[PDB]
Ligand binder design. Structure first.
Ligand SMILES: [Cl-]
Length: 109
């Protein structure tokens, strides 16, 4: 139902890939709105599962992903009928890259 595995690294990497795909679609793609609606659902599902785990809450990967996912959610809530500005898309992408770096640093610690 969620598609979440319960493995924080696998799920975060999969969510990053899903979000990258949704954001990369052209504004005029027929499926853009649907992909958006699914991004919202998936980020909500991800927080619903993982925010209850205070181990994960202490980690940089988690903190940065929360910053990202909040910025995405906030755009929709404030500007539901406008596209993500290029400047936000660029920031989200930097954040994703940072999450991935943090996941690898955490795994080798
Ligand atoms: Cl709007």
């Amino acid at each position: 139902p969620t598609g979440l595995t319960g493995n924080f690294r696998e799920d975060t990497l999969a969510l990053i890939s899903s979000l990258r795909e949704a954001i990369a679609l052209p504004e005029n793609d027929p499926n853009k709105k649907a992909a958006q609606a699914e991004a919202r659902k998936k980020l909500n599902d991800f927080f619903a599962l993982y925010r209850r785990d205070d181990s994960l809450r202490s980690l940089s990967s988690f903190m940065t992903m929360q910053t990202a996912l909040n910025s995405l959610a906030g755009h929709y809530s404030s500007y539901p009928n406008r596209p993500l500005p290029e400047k936000l898309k660029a920031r989200l992408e930097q954040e994703f890259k940072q999450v991935e770096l943090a996941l690898d640093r955490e795994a080798k610690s």
